[PDB]
Design an enzyme around this catalytic site. Structure first.
Site, PDB file in Angstrom:
ATOM      1  N   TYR B  15       0.789  -1.224   0.000  1.00 18.42           N
ATOM      2  CA  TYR B  15       0.000   0.000   0.000  1.00 18.42           C
ATOM      3  C   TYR B  15       0.825   1.280   0.000  1.00 18.42           C
ATOM      4  O   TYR B  15       0.238   2.369  -0.024  1.00 18.42           O
ATOM      5  CB  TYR B  15      -0.953   0.016   1.206  1.00 18.42           C
ATOM      6  CG  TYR B  15      -1.812  -1.227   1.315  1.00 18.42           C
ATOM      7  CD1 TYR B  15      -2.975  -1.358   0.569  1.00 18.42           C
ATOM      8  CD2 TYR B  15      -1.454  -2.271   2.158  1.00 18.42           C
ATOM      9  CE1 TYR B  15      -3.762  -2.493   0.659  1.00 18.42           C
ATOM     10  CE2 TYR B  15      -2.235  -3.411   2.256  1.00 18.42           C
ATOM     11  CZ  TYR B  15      -3.387  -3.516   1.503  1.00 18.42           C
ATOM     12  OH  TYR B  15      -4.167  -4.644   1.596  1.00 18.42           O
ATOM     13  N   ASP B  17       2.640   2.646  -2.325  1.00 18.20           N
ATOM     14  CA  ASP B  17       2.516   3.426  -3.553  1.00 18.20           C
ATOM     15  C   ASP B  17       1.344   4.393  -3.462  1.00 18.20           C
ATOM     16  O   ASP B  17       1.493   5.595  -3.706  1.00 18.20           O
ATOM     17  CB  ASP B  17       2.349   2.501  -4.761  1.00 18.20           C
ATOM     18  CG  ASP B  17       3.459   1.476  -4.877  1.00 18.20           C
ATOM     19  OD1 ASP B  17       4.644   1.864  -4.871  1.00 18.20           O
ATOM     20  OD2 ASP B  17       3.142   0.274  -4.972  1.00 18.20           O
ATOM     21  N   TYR B 193       5.739  -7.317   7.168  1.00 28.86           N
ATOM     22  CA  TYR B 193       5.531  -8.384   6.205  1.00 28.86           C
ATOM     23  C   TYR B 193       5.581  -9.724   6.942  1.00 28.86           C
ATOM     24  O   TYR B 193       5.550  -9.780   8.175  1.00 28.86           O
ATOM     25  CB  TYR B 193       6.576  -8.296   5.091  1.00 28.86           C
ATOM     26  CG  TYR B 193       6.735  -6.907   4.512  1.00 28.86           C
ATOM     27  CD1 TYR B 193       5.782  -6.381   3.651  1.00 28.86           C
ATOM     28  CD2 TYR B 193       7.836  -6.123   4.830  1.00 28.86           C
ATOM     29  CE1 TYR B 193       5.918  -5.113   3.124  1.00 28.86           C
ATOM     30  CE2 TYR B 193       7.982  -4.853   4.307  1.00 28.86           C
ATOM     31  CZ  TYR B 193       7.020  -4.353   3.454  1.00 28.86           C
ATOM     32  OH  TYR B 193       7.161  -3.088   2.931  1.00 28.86           O
ATOM     33  N   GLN B 255      -5.944   6.593   7.048  1.00 33.55           N
ATOM     34  CA  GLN B 255      -4.543   6.974   7.210  1.00 33.55           C
ATOM     35  C   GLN B 255      -4.345   7.869   8.428  1.00 33.55           C
ATOM     36  O   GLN B 255      -3.352   7.732   9.151  1.00 33.55           O
ATOM     37  CB  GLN B 255      -4.046   7.671   5.943  1.00 33.55           C
ATOM     38  CG  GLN B 255      -2.633   7.289   5.523  1.00 33.55           C
ATOM     39  CD  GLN B 255      -2.246   7.891   4.180  1.00 33.55           C
ATOM     40  OE1 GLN B 255      -2.801   8.906   3.759  1.00 33.55           O
ATOM     41  NE2 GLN B 255      -1.297   7.259   3.499  1.00 33.55           N
ATOM     42  N   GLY B 272       8.007  -0.716   5.081  1.00 40.17           N
ATOM     43  CA  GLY B 272       7.839   0.054   3.853  1.00 40.17           C
ATOM     44  C   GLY B 272       8.541   1.397   3.903  1.00 40.17           C
ATOM     45  O   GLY B 272       9.730   1.493   4.226  1.00 40.17           O
ATOM     46  N   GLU B 273       7.803   2.453   3.571  1.00 36.76           N
ATOM     47  CA  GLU B 273       8.357   3.804   3.551  1.00 36.76           C
ATOM     48  C   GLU B 273       7.462   4.832   4.227  1.00 36.76           C
ATOM     49  O   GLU B 273       7.968   5.674   4.973  1.00 36.76           O
ATOM     50  CB  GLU B 273       8.647   4.236   2.097  1.00 36.76           C
ATOM     51  CG  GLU B 273       9.686   3.367   1.395  1.00 36.76           C
ATOM     52  CD  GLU B 273      10.073   3.880   0.015  1.00 36.76           C
ATOM     53  OE1 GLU B 273       9.649   4.995  -0.361  1.00 36.76           O
ATOM     54  OE2 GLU B 273      10.808   3.162  -0.696  1.00 36.76           O
ATOM     55  N   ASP B 274       6.148   4.786   3.996  1.00 34.42           N
ATOM     56  CA  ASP B 274       5.268   5.809   4.556  1.00 34.42           C
ATOM     57  C   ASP B 274       5.084   5.622   6.061  1.00 34.42           C
ATOM     58  O   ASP B 274       5.349   6.538   6.848  1.00 34.42           O
ATOM     59  CB  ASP B 274       3.918   5.801   3.838  1.00 34.42           C
ATOM     60  CG  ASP B 274       3.026   6.951   4.269  1.00 34.42           C
ATOM     61  OD1 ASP B 274       3.398   8.120   4.031  1.00 34.42           O
ATOM     62  OD2 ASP B 274       1.955   6.690   4.854  1.00 34.42           O
TER      63      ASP B 274
HETATM   64  C1  LIG Z   1      -1.760  -0.434   9.017  1.00 31.48           C
HETATM   65  C2  LIG Z   1      -2.345   0.748   8.183  1.00 31.48           C
HETATM   66  C3  LIG Z   1      -1.596   1.333   7.192  1.00 31.48           C
HETATM   67  N1  LIG Z   1      -2.107   2.354   6.487  1.00 31.48           N
HETATM   68  C4  LIG Z   1      -1.378   2.932   5.490  1.00 31.48           C
HETATM   69  C5  LIG Z   1      -0.110   3.696   5.996  1.00 31.48           C
HETATM   70  C6  LIG Z   1       0.647   3.701   5.008  1.00 31.48           C
HETATM   71  O1  LIG Z   1       0.426   4.903   4.195  1.00 31.48           O
HETATM   72  C7  LIG Z   1       0.261   2.386   4.099  1.00 31.48           C
HETATM   73  C8  LIG Z   1       1.422   1.387   4.127  1.00 31.48           C
HETATM   74  O2  LIG Z   1       2.467   1.871   3.253  1.00 31.48           O
HETATM   75  P1  LIG Z   1       4.032   1.616   3.672  1.00 31.48           P
HETATM   76  O3  LIG Z   1       4.272   2.085   5.080  1.00 31.48           O
HETATM   77  O4  LIG Z   1       4.924   2.376   2.736  1.00 31.48           O
HETATM   78  O5  LIG Z   1       4.379   0.006   3.580  1.00 31.48           O
HETATM   79  P2  LIG Z   1       3.883  -0.986   2.354  1.00 31.48           P
HETATM   80  O6  LIG Z   1       4.170  -0.327   1.022  1.00 31.48           O
HETATM   81  O7  LIG Z   1       4.640  -2.282   2.449  1.00 31.48           O
HETATM   82  O8  LIG Z   1       2.407  -1.249   2.473  1.00 31.48           O
HETATM   83  O9  LIG Z   1      -0.789   1.862   4.612  1.00 31.48           O
HETATM   84  C9  LIG Z   1      -3.356   2.791   6.746  1.00 31.48           C
HETATM   85  O10 LIG Z   1      -3.829   3.705   6.114  1.00 31.48           O
HETATM   86  N2  LIG Z   1      -4.105   2.201   7.739  1.00 31.48           N
HETATM   87  C10 LIG Z   1      -3.602   1.197   8.445  1.00 31.48           C
HETATM   88  O11 LIG Z   1      -4.261   0.686   9.317  1.00 31.48           O
END
Ligand SMILES: Cc1cn([C@H]2C[C@H](O)[C@@H](COP(=O)(O)OP(=O)(O)O)O2)c(=O)[nH]c1=O
Lengths: 178, 377
Positions: B15, B17, B193, B255, B272-274
């Site tokens: 998620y 991206d 992961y 988010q 991830g990154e965000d």
């Molecule tokens: C766990 C969780 C993540 N997110 C969002 C946060 C981050 O923007 C996104 C995860 O992105 P990221 O942290 O980059 O890791 P990955 O690319 O492996 O998924 O998911 C939510 O919106 N709600 C949630 O409950």
């Protein structure tokens, strides 16, 4: 007649929007996932202007094939490098135009190089595709160092003072003498 | 001035991206008054991080952002004043032609991946000379200068400080998720992961002296937690007790609610990154599960952030931190490392707050994009 950006090397030339740019330095960087980034230091071959550009490793550029003439290395003046052909003509090259040779440059180098020309004007020098270097220090493969201080992976069967072949397009080990 | 921005988001996996592009798109519209078109080719992933979103609608307006499905085949439309290909994705060929058929050709930006390596500084803001004459540049997020900075909303740290200093505000948010912390319980969030080191860590939380409440959002890691809990299924709302460890499954939330979750916990395991950056804004200890790459490329990126993040730490805390993260990303073996980090959690917390406040003084990435476009005109 298009080439991938990660396939370009120092000393080669690309046609970008009608402008001939010589690649003084090309560097490869691994970004996220499988993406990659190639940073290039370019110099315009008609106006002399220098710039830095960045590409994806998969980006495609149009190369420019240039004339060549066999040349050999003599000595290191300051701050220019001098090369001589088979007819004793001197070619003085700046350090910025030799990033492909500087990796394996050695004093008393016997390798037969090729000077790249753009309209009877030398712009860079290229090493032969295969060079012979001696190992100055070492302990399937292990890390060793050459006389000029460069670090590269060589075969584990190698020892101090052995002769190895290096592929200059990759800068990696190729073979060794028995 | 109000300029239009195209943001193309290719959901390769997970998620991050859509997480980054949605966070960026929302910020350009809210605190910069820009018109934004967010193109996403996997609308189901956008609906996961935005519950108000309709995953089947071709186009919808959310928080002043125009979210469009990136369809195949691509329908040609007019190009915006700025076109951003996020994470080095490939633009539609017809859209690159729409970028040239304008009085002022579109500013072309490649928003690259986030890395703490030093090489991104020399590449940031450099041009990408195109054969067609389009003005293209690469934009690198970064933790140090020079770089494009990091995404940070206006007043984010101020709201985080007011939230963490209010016991009632933290209990009210946790109650909205169906969570009530017990007295003396330590809160830990888990976003990762598939991690083989997870059961070994859960054993240490189970056998510890201080009780822990592990809040796990619904995701890929649930199968590993279920196997350790020795249960068949884990659903949202389930609570399991294993000695000093309490595990509760949380829903994938919006988010902004994920922010408040990170702000409540004493230790945030992210990936991830965000969410990696979001955990840093929380000013709390962090556990990073970095995206695995081929030829162990991610290890250089993990070490590059550690060397920058452990600059202000004491030597023994920095060593326990590097050992734990390395084991967290390359097979178990974090027993003694976790014991060392657990003893110095207060000191780690103070350094996490200082790292966030020092980063909070750098101009945010969205503001650098607007300044880049303004100076580019
Ligand atoms: C766990 C969780 C993540 N997110 C969002 C946060 C981050 O923007 C996104 C995860 O992105 P990221 O942290 O980059 O890791 P990955 O690319 O492996 O998924 O998911 C939510 O919106 N709600 C949630 O409950």
């Amino acid at each position: 007649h298009m080439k991938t950006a990660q396939e370009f090397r120092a000393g080669q030339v690309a046609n970008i929007n009608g402008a001939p740019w010589v690649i003084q330095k090309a560097e490869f960087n691994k970004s996220g996932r499988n993406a990659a980034v190639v940073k290039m230091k370019l110099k315009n071959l008609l106006t002399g202007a220098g710039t830095e550009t960045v590409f994806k490793a998969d980006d495609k550029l149009e190369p420019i094939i240039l004339d060549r003439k066999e040349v050999t290395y003599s000595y290191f003046a300051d701050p220019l490098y001098v090369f001589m052909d088979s007819e004793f003509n001197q070619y003085e090259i700046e350090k910025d135009d030799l990033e492909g040779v500087l990796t394996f440059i050695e004093d008393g180098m016997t390798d037969i190089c090729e000077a790249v020309f753009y309209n009877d004007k030398v712009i860079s020098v290229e090493l032969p595709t295969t060079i012979v270097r001696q190992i100055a220090y070492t302990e399937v493969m292990k890390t060793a160092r050459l006389n000029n201080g460069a670090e590269l992976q060589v075969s584990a069967f190698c020892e101090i003072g052995d002769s190895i072949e290096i592929d200059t397009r990759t800068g990696e080990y190729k073979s060794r003498v028995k | 001035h109000m300029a239009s921005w195209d943001i193309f988001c290719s959901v390769v996996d997970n998620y991050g991206d859509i997480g980054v592009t949605w966070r960026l798109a929302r910020q350009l519209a809210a605190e910069h008054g820009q018109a934004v078109r967010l193109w996403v080719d996997e609308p189901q992933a956008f609906a996961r991080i935005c519950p108000r979103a309709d995953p089947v609608a071709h186009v919808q307006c959310l928080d002043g952002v125009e979210v469009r499905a990136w369809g195949r085949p691509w329908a040609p439309v007019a190009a915006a004043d700025v076109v951003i290909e996020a994470f080095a994705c490939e633009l539609p060929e017809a859209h690159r032609q729409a970028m040239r058929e304008r009085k002022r050709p579109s500013l072309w930006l490649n928003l690259e991946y986030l890395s703490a390596e030093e090489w991104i500084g020399s590449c940031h803001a450099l041009p990408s000379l195109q054969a067609c004459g389009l003005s293209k540049y690469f934009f690198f997020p970064g933790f140090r200068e020079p770089s494009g900075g990091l995404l940070r909303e206006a007043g984010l740290l101020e709201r985080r400080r007011r939230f963490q200093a209010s016991v009632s505000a933290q209990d009210e948010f946790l109650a909205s998720l169906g969570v009530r912390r017990k007295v003396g319980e330590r809160l830990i969030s888990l976003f990762a992961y598939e991690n083989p080191a997870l059961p070994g860590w859960l054993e240490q939380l189970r056998d510890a002296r201080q009780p822990s409440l592990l809040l796990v959002p619904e995701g890929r890691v649930l199968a590993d937690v279920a196997d350790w809990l020795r249960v068949a299924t884990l659903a949202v709302g389930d609570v399991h007790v294993r000695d000093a460890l309490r595990v509760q499954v949380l829903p994938f939330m919006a988010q902004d609610d994920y922010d408040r979750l990170l702000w409540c916990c004493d230790l945030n395991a992210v990936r991830g990154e965000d969410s990696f950056v979001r955990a840093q804004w929380a000013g709390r200890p962090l556990l990073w599960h970095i995206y695995r790459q081929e030829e162990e490329t991610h290890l250089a990126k993990l070490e590059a952030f550690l060397e920058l993040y452990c600059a202000g730490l004491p030597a023994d805390l920095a060593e326990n931190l590097r050992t734990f993260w390395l084991a967290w990303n390359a097979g178990g073996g974090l027993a003694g490392a976790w014991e060392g980090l657990e003893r110095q959690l207060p000191e780690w917390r103070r350094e996490a707050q200082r790292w966030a406040d020092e980063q909070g003084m750098r101009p945010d990435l969205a503001a650098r994009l607007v300044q880049f476009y303004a100076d580019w005109l």
